[PDB]
Amino acid sequence: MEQTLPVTVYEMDFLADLMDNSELIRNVTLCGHLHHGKTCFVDCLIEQTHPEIRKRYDQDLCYTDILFTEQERGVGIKSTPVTVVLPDTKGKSYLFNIMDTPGHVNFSDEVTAGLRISDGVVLFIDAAEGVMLNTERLIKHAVQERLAVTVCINKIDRLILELKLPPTDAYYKLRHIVDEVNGLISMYSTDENLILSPLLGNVCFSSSQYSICFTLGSFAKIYADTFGDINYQEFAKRLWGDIYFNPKTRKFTKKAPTSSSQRSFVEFILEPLYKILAQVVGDVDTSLPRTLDELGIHLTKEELKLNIRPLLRLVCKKFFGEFTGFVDMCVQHIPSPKVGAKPKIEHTYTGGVDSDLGEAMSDCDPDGPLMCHTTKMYSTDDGVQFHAFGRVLSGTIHAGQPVKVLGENYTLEDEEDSQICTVGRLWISVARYHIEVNRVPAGNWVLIEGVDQPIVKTATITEPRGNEEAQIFRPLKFNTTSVIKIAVEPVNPSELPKMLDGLRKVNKSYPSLTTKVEESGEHVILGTGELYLDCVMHDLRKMYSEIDIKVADPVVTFCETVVETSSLKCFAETPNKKNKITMIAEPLEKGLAEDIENEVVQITWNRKKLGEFFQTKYDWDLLAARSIWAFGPDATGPNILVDDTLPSEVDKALLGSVKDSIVQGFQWGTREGPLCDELIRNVKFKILDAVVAQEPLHRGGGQIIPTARRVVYSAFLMATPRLMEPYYFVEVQAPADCVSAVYTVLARRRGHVTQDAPIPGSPLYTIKAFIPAIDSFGFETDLRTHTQGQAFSLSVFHHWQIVPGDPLDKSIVIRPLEPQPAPHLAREFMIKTRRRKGLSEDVSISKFFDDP
Amino acid sequence: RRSRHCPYLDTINRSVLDFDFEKLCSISLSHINAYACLVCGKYFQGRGLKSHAYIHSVQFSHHVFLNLHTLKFYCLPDNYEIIDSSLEDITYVLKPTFTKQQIANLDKQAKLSRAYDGTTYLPGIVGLNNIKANDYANAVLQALSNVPPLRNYFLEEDNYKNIKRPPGDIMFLLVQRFGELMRKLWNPRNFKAHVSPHEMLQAVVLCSKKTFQITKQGDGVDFLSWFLNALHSALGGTKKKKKTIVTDVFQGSMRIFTKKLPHPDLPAEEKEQLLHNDEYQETMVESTFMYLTLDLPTAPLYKDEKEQLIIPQVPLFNILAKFNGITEKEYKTYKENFLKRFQLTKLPPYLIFCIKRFTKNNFFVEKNPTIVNFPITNVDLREYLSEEVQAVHKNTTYDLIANIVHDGKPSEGSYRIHVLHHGTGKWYELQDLQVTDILPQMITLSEAYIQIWKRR
Amino acid sequence: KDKSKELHAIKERYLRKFVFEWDASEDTSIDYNPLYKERHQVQLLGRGFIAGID
Amino acid sequence: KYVNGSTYQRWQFTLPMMSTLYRLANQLLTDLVDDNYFYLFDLKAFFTSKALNMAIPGGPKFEPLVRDINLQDEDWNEFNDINKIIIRQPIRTEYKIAFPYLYNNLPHHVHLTWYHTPNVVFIKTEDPDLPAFYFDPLINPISHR
Amino acid sequence: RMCKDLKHLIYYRFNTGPVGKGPGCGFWAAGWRVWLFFMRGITPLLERWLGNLLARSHFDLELRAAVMHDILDMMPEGIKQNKARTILQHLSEAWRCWKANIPWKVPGLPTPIENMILRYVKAKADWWTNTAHYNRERIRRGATVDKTVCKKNLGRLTRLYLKAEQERQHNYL
Amino acid sequence: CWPRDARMRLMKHDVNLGRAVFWDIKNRLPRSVTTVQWENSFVSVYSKDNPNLLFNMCGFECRILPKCRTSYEEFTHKDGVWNLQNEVTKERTAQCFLRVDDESMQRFHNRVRQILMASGSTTFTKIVNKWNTALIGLMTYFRE
Amino acid sequence: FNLRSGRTRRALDIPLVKNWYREHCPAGQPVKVRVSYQKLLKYYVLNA
Ligand SMILES: O=P(O)(O)O[C@H]1[C@H](OP(=O)(O)O)[C@@H](OP(=O)(O)O)[C@H](OP(=O)(O)O)[C@@H](OP(=O)(O)O)[C@H]1OP(=O)(O)O
Ligand SMILES: Nc1nc2c(ncn2[C@@H]2O[C@H](COP(=O)(O)OP(=O)(O)OP(=O)(O)O)[C@@H](O)[C@H]2O)c(=O)[nH]1
Ligand SMILES: [Mg+2]
Ligand SMILES: [Zn+2]
């Protein structure tokens, strides 16, 4: 290498040597809610590890947020990896691979691309705002991706300099935040060994505006370096949580002396922090130098001339020092990744831990078979070449070494999604500079050059000529659903290829982006919201294709459901006229689609446990519960294919002969659907009867897949079909007076307010509401404009709800450019999608039969 | 095992098999594993369950697909390879390959080739499609086709595939898409007698950064200058490799003799006192040309008695009076007038004359309508060379092999090109898609804009 | 008028003298939307006040 | 102590002086603790609106920066087919300023406005006889356990 | 207008509360600012005007006058007192012969003077073609012209269209 | 000159069909005999997507809109609208909406400009006679 | 007022009411002060 890297506290030979020892690596995702302090915390760690990289006085250096849209919007948009070497409280330097993820909920997918290559999570929580929408969603997604969860309660200065809470009441605020996170983790995990408390070191308190960062151990070590004889870990065991200090017996008691004494956190931690911040912001000129002398801090005369916020940042940089409590927390409570290799392989590898390669990936050894896994593609700012980013789980990538990239459709029997690509260069990716390395051992994160061509979203890089039984890591199961659908054409059609090129590039950049072409030749981008698609459209017009691009109106993708069983038992014969299939479609039981989608059931189970679930949970007979063939359009989709074919009428071996093709046709039918070619949802397809041809060249394949799709379509349409609306769950953070204004804004957009609850310890309220996602376009603009910016909303996908109309209603006339009323919205939503899709003007229930 | 016995091979129609464009899935945009459906020509991500080729095969009953990269045919949904020799022309239209025996005998091809539709053509004498305003580039690309050594380089991908690129290098797309176009134009078993240059031109639009668009036509001399310089830049492997095929074919070495004229507004004593200053003496700034720029004398502003045509006319040797060591050309920049003499030292095997038609006056761009009276089968360029040089240059007789002609106004102009088919002696006027057989005596009557000559 | 201006906004999204005063035709903030006409002025926790006004 | 010198170039003030000068200038200042008030009303928002030939309601109105696309001159493609467009709410001027790349064909010379900055929950102190660190009744109570 | 703007800005905050309408508001810093920022810009204009004070379409006509001036300078004074009118008639005759597509070669004219008249005719030819096409886009667009501009334009375009038509016939031949 | 819903709607099949029809007609004419240029032509497709058939003939700008195809309406008599009925069954099957070509309105405008520009030294009666003559020619040619 | 040290500015350079028209125009205002707010914003934006 030898590239020109900035001046740093460590040196890059020590970083490259900590890369080898994979016990001293912490793959950490800093995730939280929007603007909860993660990028400023990475800025604080960068300022700690880089003496020449300093934040400006009046404007925070972000140092991630390296995109232009990130610097202009102020919202983190892509996850930026930062590899630093951070020292611990004991002074021990650990290599830290930190993923600064976007906290905006629309970019939740980006967090998932960081959660896959991480062994741990630091959940950042505003101490003023508390637990918000994306903090709950990333608690859920962090304990569901089997990650160790720690908490940084950032912005504790807002308890001091904004709310001006008393130290006892701000302790109550922080304790309420820790209790809320504990309740959320106990909600989304049956285990209670991952209790988060600052006594355990799981909770860190911070203020990344002023570079405060302490756990209880690192604040106790300030006492241990100020006063010699105290052992700080035993002190940190007493600092938090209804433990009071008796200064006559000098001992920490659970019983409160004097009934007006404070807790150990208020006495020993919060009141010194309040006195530091109050002596800086209130009494700089009068009484800051004597308290600074009491804290051991001497500032230069040039430094005391600073304004109050840079002086606060400086005073707390000298008092708290390095961010060794963050390193305490992430070293004690985030795995090794040697220790964290086994849950990572058990969760994210498709072969599991029990494979011959899953064993060697659980060992995480650099002299093993190469098993890198990339989840992010990072474009260089010329836009042309991408760099695949991910972690090496075994082996060592080398620059110049040919390698076998496996895409997401690579199975061991379908070996065509692989490609042998020569690795161009390797970078250890810090945010604004890359350390070019010759090799990257296991456990480490790496930017790889040259493997970007055969992959779109997610790769498993292995080696060629060995690892023939190498499977892919699982694709990124995202936190939400890319629902908002925009059509995209070039202004000049002659530069369509540039746009297509750019469309491929935004498909690499945004992990839950879906770029497709519909049957009308309409190019379609799916996103999670309007900020997400605004940044996608910015990158499409400015970064990747330098051309002008018309956008359509944002629309949503709909689902399709049924509400009653099919009227007549529908059938379809093949073009052979052999192989009749006879299905009915009935709606699923309530909560079953949520069970199939959230992996409460799997078809990867055996028939016994699956049948036992469906018997004990949804009142299915074991006749029906042992007869489940597939699970909707994917292996976890909200539909079920059952065969109620009795073995008396049907030969069951002759039916298992074509079970694969009937399952394929059912999955394709639920993937498209006959109403508007958008996914079928919450429909049980019961194969009632199945004639099967006897010889295999008359059944199978080109006969029975489209026939099974036709009988899925006709069984769906004879059941009473409904469209489904995506509903956004909207968490509004408004003031107390703007709550009736939030209600007024939501009442114009079909939004039902679930709750308006006060943020405890803040003067704000959270209005949780359910807007339809077709009615959320400019909802946050409506809300922040109507409330003069005081209310702010984040809206994420929650569920699908049936549109109040009936989509197969030719009685409804729709004037083309009018907002339709509710009782025929589905009729507007079905045909316009059908026009967008370009299908026929209306779908008849008899289009897929054999009688017409 | 049901390869060689596929039922669905009659379902292929080659009338829809357009293999000239971006090999992306028509649904997912992906270049990874693209498969042409041979029943409709549309590309779909290729292979497996839940892919676009599979779902297309069961959706349309289109049961035969060709891997656009692997050149292997596949019957879908029941995925087996198809091994049939009757499908070999589909892969040869998709990916034309040229052996060395096929390249050496490529210019000895007198018999017409037939396309799949009943349309005879000659390889290389093949129409390039016109997207909106494109004929400048179609004319130049048809001029660099029918240049044998540049063609023979770009007909084997192995001649240029393994040469090194910078990581973020878009400029090599010109090299590989020019090779793709050259293999499509010289394809003797094509499915149609014309080739869309659209991918080659998207490479041109991307690499020149919206210079030389397809919607707006440029000049053929500008496009040929940029395109030869960009092929020569991109065929150098992470450096200026000094000799590429473009230098080996088109580049010669001239010897420019710049002489500073003193100043015109001076007295004669100072004017001949400035001669010994040696700033006003002759230099030798010997350089290399891809093309010779031939300057026509201006349209004579008045008709004369002879050749009662309004069309002016120069011989070729009078505008090749430039590039001998006697004729001096006035150069006029701010404060300084020079007297440039030219002197050809290395004559290329394939010499391009870019005859300068369009000059801008004070008000608009005027096209010189002067007709160069050139022979087409013999120009002895021996006397445009130093006697220091004429012992090295054994062959200096050139035959015309390509003649790009601009027709019309500088605004609403068109480009055609008279290419000499080798093997025959026949000349063909290609205006973008139509291929007329032009007579050898009628080439010298058109406004010769760009000419390529072959040294024999 | 405001329902008329709402559907007009939709229908057009898709389908010498020294004058010392500004005209009222120069004006903006002629909205149809009741969320944008009556725009819920900031109660700055009931303790901050707008500048200049008594 | 308080200024540079006789040139009157740099001042350095004691925070009681700045506090009482802030109180004397209370009538000239709006007591906003944020720039969230200027959402779609800041400079970037107005640069965007000028670039898109759109007028924010409380804001300025300019000449068009570019020549406008006349939406009676475009000729009913499959893209702008009004039979495909689901209308729920009118896409306002504010939505095309707020998300200029989502809601505009041809956003040129357009400025991405700042998004939310987090709501500065600053409780102004009405009473100086109150402690500086005080659980104000604007603060919602924290119900213990 | 701006100062009136600031008056409307200030008065409507000033005249709230118990303060009503009336002439008592003076918060003059805004308008005073505006007029000083005007003085900033016109200070060097009035200074340049006082420093200057307190000190011490027809390209054919200009082109014909310039070439006549250039021809005359290199004539001797004993010969230019007869020759000058004649070379103006030679200029106008060469231009009449260009407008007519007929040969203009005066045999007794010396070839530097002939070359300068040829040059003049080429410059006037390019201007004449450009002003004919420009005036035609003016007339055809609908811009307001008078009778002699259209008559002149039609004569220019008739000679240009017949030059193009004679070139078309000779291209056919 | 027609409204956007009344012009040809540029759907992909109809645009490809119009260009295909034009290309088929253009190949039948050799380029040396006569050319037929796309830029000076107009190819209106009536299909299931375009409900109006459009043509400029003889200075008239005609748009035929069938009764079966985007009328849905009782009509009173409008002047430029030609109720096209079937010859055998006498049923109004289409309406031809007439207009004047923009070249024809421009010819009338340039004719009035030629009247005014060459007015000059003429009699007011002659200027008004030229106005009357141009107005009778326009109004009796282009009546509805 | 968030500063405690600063550089001295000209009295021309201090617009006392720039952050007044940079606010939204208050409720109940007549039309001339509203267009005055919008045109003060217009020349503010043209300056910036
Ligand atoms: O806005 P202008 O056209 O420049 O006229 C204003 C205006 O008078 P009008 O309301 O009749 O237009 C003011 O009245 P209000 O805006 O308060 O309603 C008035 O101010 P006061 O009535 O409060 O005195 C002011 O008078 P002045 O600027 O002298 O104080 C006067 O300006 P004119 O002197 O030009 O009439
Ligand atoms: N009062 C206070 N403000 C802070 C603190 N830390 C950051 N901020 C401010 O809060 C805003 C949060 O911005 P970031 O921290 O950069 O954003 P983020 O938390 O990473 O979240 P994303 O925008 O989704 O990336 C910034 O403008 C900071 O100025 C803090 O500790 N106290
Ligand atoms: Mg961030
Ligand atoms: Zn097909």
Side-chain angles (χ1 to χ4, degrees), chain B residues 258-272:
Chain B
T258 309
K259 183 194 208 65
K260 203 161 153 156
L261 280 185
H263 194 74
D265 312 274
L266 266 62
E269 193 99 349
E270 194 184 351
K271 272 170 96 74
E272 66 90 20

PDB file of all heavy atoms in Angstrom, chain B residues 258-272:
ATOM      1  N   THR B 258       7.777  25.387 -39.841  1.00  0.00           N
ATOM      2  CA  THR B 258       7.170  26.653 -39.464  1.00  0.00           C
ATOM      3  C   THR B 258       8.213  27.755 -39.589  1.00  0.00           C
ATOM      4  O   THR B 258       9.349  27.594 -39.138  1.00  0.00           O
ATOM      5  CB  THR B 258       6.618  26.585 -38.043  1.00  0.00           C
ATOM      6  OG1 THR B 258       5.793  25.423 -37.913  1.00  0.00           O
ATOM      7  CG2 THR B 258       5.778  27.801 -37.740  1.00  0.00           C
ATOM      8  N   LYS B 259       7.833  28.856 -40.225  1.00  0.00           N
ATOM      9  CA  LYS B 259       8.700  30.012 -40.397  1.00  0.00           C
ATOM     10  C   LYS B 259       7.931  31.267 -40.030  1.00  0.00           C
ATOM     11  O   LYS B 259       6.933  31.595 -40.674  1.00  0.00           O
ATOM     12  CB  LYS B 259       9.202  30.115 -41.834  1.00  0.00           C
ATOM     13  CG  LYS B 259      10.163  31.243 -42.073  1.00  0.00           C
ATOM     14  CD  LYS B 259      10.338  31.483 -43.552  1.00  0.00           C
ATOM     15  CE  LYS B 259      11.696  32.071 -43.853  1.00  0.00           C
ATOM     16  NZ  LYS B 259      12.787  31.126 -43.515  1.00  0.00           N
ATOM     17  N   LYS B 260       8.404  31.970 -39.014  1.00  0.00           N
ATOM     18  CA  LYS B 260       7.747  33.173 -38.521  1.00  0.00           C
ATOM     19  C   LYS B 260       8.027  34.315 -39.490  1.00  0.00           C
ATOM     20  O   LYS B 260       9.182  34.699 -39.688  1.00  0.00           O
ATOM     21  CB  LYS B 260       8.248  33.488 -37.117  1.00  0.00           C
ATOM     22  CG  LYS B 260       7.337  34.333 -36.249  1.00  0.00           C
ATOM     23  CD  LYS B 260       7.736  34.158 -34.787  1.00  0.00           C
ATOM     24  CE  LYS B 260       7.384  35.362 -33.929  1.00  0.00           C
ATOM     25  NZ  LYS B 260       7.242  34.998 -32.496  1.00  0.00           N
ATOM     26  N   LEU B 261       6.978  34.839 -40.113  1.00  0.00           N
ATOM     27  CA  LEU B 261       7.123  36.053 -40.900  1.00  0.00           C
ATOM     28  C   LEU B 261       7.261  37.236 -39.947  1.00  0.00           C
ATOM     29  O   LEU B 261       6.587  37.259 -38.915  1.00  0.00           O
ATOM     30  CB  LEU B 261       5.920  36.240 -41.818  1.00  0.00           C
ATOM     31  CG  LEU B 261       5.925  35.413 -43.100  1.00  0.00           C
ATOM     32  CD1 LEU B 261       4.738  35.791 -43.955  1.00  0.00           C
ATOM     33  CD2 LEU B 261       7.221  35.618 -43.861  1.00  0.00           C
ATOM     34  N   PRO B 262       8.148  38.228 -40.257  1.00  0.00           N
ATOM     35  CA  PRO B 262       8.638  39.158 -39.222  1.00  0.00           C
ATOM     36  C   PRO B 262       7.578  39.996 -38.529  1.00  0.00           C
ATOM     37  O   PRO B 262       7.324  39.813 -37.333  1.00  0.00           O
ATOM     38  CB  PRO B 262       9.606  40.058 -40.000  1.00  0.00           C
ATOM     39  CG  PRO B 262       9.981  39.275 -41.204  1.00  0.00           C
ATOM     40  CD  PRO B 262       8.755  38.517 -41.568  1.00  0.00           C
ATOM     41  N   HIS B 263       6.938  40.869 -39.291  1.00  0.00           N
ATOM     42  CA  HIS B 263       5.692  41.580 -39.045  1.00  0.00           C
ATOM     43  C   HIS B 263       5.460  42.360 -40.326  1.00  0.00           C
ATOM     44  O   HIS B 263       6.423  42.848 -40.931  1.00  0.00           O
ATOM     45  CB  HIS B 263       5.745  42.511 -37.830  1.00  0.00           C
ATOM     46  CG  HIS B 263       4.399  42.978 -37.363  1.00  0.00           C
ATOM     47  ND1 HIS B 263       3.520  42.162 -36.687  1.00  0.00           N
ATOM     48  CD2 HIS B 263       3.778  44.171 -37.495  1.00  0.00           C
ATOM     49  CE1 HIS B 263       2.418  42.837 -36.413  1.00  0.00           C
ATOM     50  NE2 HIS B 263       2.550  44.060 -36.893  1.00  0.00           N
ATOM     51  N   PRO B 264       4.240  42.498 -40.774  1.00  0.00           N
ATOM     52  CA  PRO B 264       4.018  43.121 -42.082  1.00  0.00           C
ATOM     53  C   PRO B 264       4.109  44.643 -42.076  1.00  0.00           C
ATOM     54  O   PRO B 264       4.422  45.245 -43.108  1.00  0.00           O
ATOM     55  CB  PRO B 264       2.622  42.622 -42.448  1.00  0.00           C
ATOM     56  CG  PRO B 264       1.964  42.363 -41.155  1.00  0.00           C
ATOM     57  CD  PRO B 264       3.029  41.814 -40.286  1.00  0.00           C
ATOM     58  N   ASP B 265       3.909  45.276 -40.920  1.00  0.00           N
ATOM     59  CA  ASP B 265       3.765  46.730 -40.811  1.00  0.00           C
ATOM     60  C   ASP B 265       5.074  47.414 -40.428  1.00  0.00           C
ATOM     61  O   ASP B 265       5.072  48.395 -39.679  1.00  0.00           O
ATOM     62  CB  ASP B 265       2.674  47.082 -39.802  1.00  0.00           C
ATOM     63  CG  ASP B 265       1.391  46.292 -40.011  1.00  0.00           C
ATOM     64  OD1 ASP B 265       0.547  46.725 -40.822  1.00  0.00           O
ATOM     65  OD2 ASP B 265       1.218  45.245 -39.350  1.00  0.00           O
ATOM     66  N   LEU B 266       6.201  46.920 -40.918  1.00  0.00           N
ATOM     67  CA  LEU B 266       7.531  47.394 -40.567  1.00  0.00           C
ATOM     68  C   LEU B 266       8.259  47.943 -41.791  1.00  0.00           C
ATOM     69  O   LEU B 266       7.891  47.631 -42.930  1.00  0.00           O
ATOM     70  CB  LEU B 266       8.342  46.256 -39.929  1.00  0.00           C
ATOM     71  CG  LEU B 266       8.337  46.162 -38.400  1.00  0.00           C
ATOM     72  CD1 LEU B 266       6.976  45.913 -37.800  1.00  0.00           C
ATOM     73  CD2 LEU B 266       9.270  45.047 -37.976  1.00  0.00           C
ATOM     74  N   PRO B 267       9.277  48.781 -41.600  1.00  0.00           N
ATOM     75  CA  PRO B 267      10.131  49.172 -42.725  1.00  0.00           C
ATOM     76  C   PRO B 267      11.058  48.044 -43.154  1.00  0.00           C
ATOM     77  O   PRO B 267      11.325  47.099 -42.410  1.00  0.00           O
ATOM     78  CB  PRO B 267      10.930  50.359 -42.175  1.00  0.00           C
ATOM     79  CG  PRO B 267      10.916  50.168 -40.711  1.00  0.00           C
ATOM     80  CD  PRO B 267       9.557  49.612 -40.414  1.00  0.00           C
ATOM     81  N   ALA B 268      11.572  48.188 -44.380  1.00  0.00           N
ATOM     82  CA  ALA B 268      12.317  47.116 -45.037  1.00  0.00           C
ATOM     83  C   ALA B 268      13.673  46.867 -44.390  1.00  0.00           C
ATOM     84  O   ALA B 268      14.158  45.727 -44.400  1.00  0.00           O
ATOM     85  CB  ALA B 268      12.496  47.436 -46.519  1.00  0.00           C
ATOM     86  N   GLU B 269      14.300  47.911 -43.837  1.00  0.00           N
ATOM     87  CA  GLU B 269      15.574  47.731 -43.147  1.00  0.00           C
ATOM     88  C   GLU B 269      15.399  46.893 -41.891  1.00  0.00           C
ATOM     89  O   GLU B 269      16.157  45.947 -41.660  1.00  0.00           O
ATOM     90  CB  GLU B 269      16.188  49.090 -42.810  1.00  0.00           C
ATOM     91  CG  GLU B 269      17.646  49.032 -42.368  1.00  0.00           C
ATOM     92  CD  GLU B 269      18.621  49.367 -43.485  1.00  0.00           C
ATOM     93  OE1 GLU B 269      18.190  49.442 -44.655  1.00  0.00           O
ATOM     94  OE2 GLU B 269      19.819  49.566 -43.190  1.00  0.00           O
ATOM     95  N   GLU B 270      14.370  47.191 -41.096  1.00  0.00           N
ATOM     96  CA  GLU B 270      14.069  46.363 -39.935  1.00  0.00           C
ATOM     97  C   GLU B 270      13.536  44.994 -40.343  1.00  0.00           C
ATOM     98  O   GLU B 270      13.803  44.001 -39.655  1.00  0.00           O
ATOM     99  CB  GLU B 270      13.064  47.079 -39.035  1.00  0.00           C
ATOM    100  CG  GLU B 270      12.914  46.481 -37.651  1.00  0.00           C
ATOM    101  CD  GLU B 270      11.837  47.175 -36.848  1.00  0.00           C
ATOM    102  OE1 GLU B 270      11.333  48.216 -37.313  1.00  0.00           O
ATOM    103  OE2 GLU B 270      11.482  46.671 -35.763  1.00  0.00           O
ATOM    104  N   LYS B 271      12.814  44.921 -41.468  1.00  0.00           N
ATOM    105  CA  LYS B 271      12.253  43.650 -41.914  1.00  0.00           C
ATOM    106  C   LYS B 271      13.326  42.668 -42.358  1.00  0.00           C
ATOM    107  O   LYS B 271      13.168  41.460 -42.161  1.00  0.00           O
ATOM    108  CB  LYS B 271      11.264  43.863 -43.055  1.00  0.00           C
ATOM    109  CG  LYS B 271       9.853  44.138 -42.596  1.00  0.00           C
ATOM    110  CD  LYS B 271       8.991  44.580 -43.754  1.00  0.00           C
ATOM    111  CE  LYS B 271       8.222  43.408 -44.319  1.00  0.00           C
ATOM    112  NZ  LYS B 271       7.120  43.038 -43.404  1.00  0.00           N
ATOM    113  N   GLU B 272      14.412  43.148 -42.960  1.00  0.00           N
ATOM    114  CA  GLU B 272      15.493  42.223 -43.260  1.00  0.00           C
ATOM    115  C   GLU B 272      16.580  42.227 -42.194  1.00  0.00           C
ATOM    116  O   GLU B 272      17.503  41.413 -42.270  1.00  0.00           O
ATOM    117  CB  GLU B 272      16.070  42.499 -44.660  1.00  0.00           C
ATOM    118  CG  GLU B 272      16.789  43.815 -44.879  1.00  0.00           C
ATOM    119  CD  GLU B 272      18.272  43.737 -44.575  1.00  0.00           C
ATOM    120  OE1 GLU B 272      18.818  42.616 -44.554  1.00  0.00           O
ATOM    121  OE2 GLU B 272      18.893  44.800 -44.373  1.00  0.00           O
TER     122      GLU B 272
END
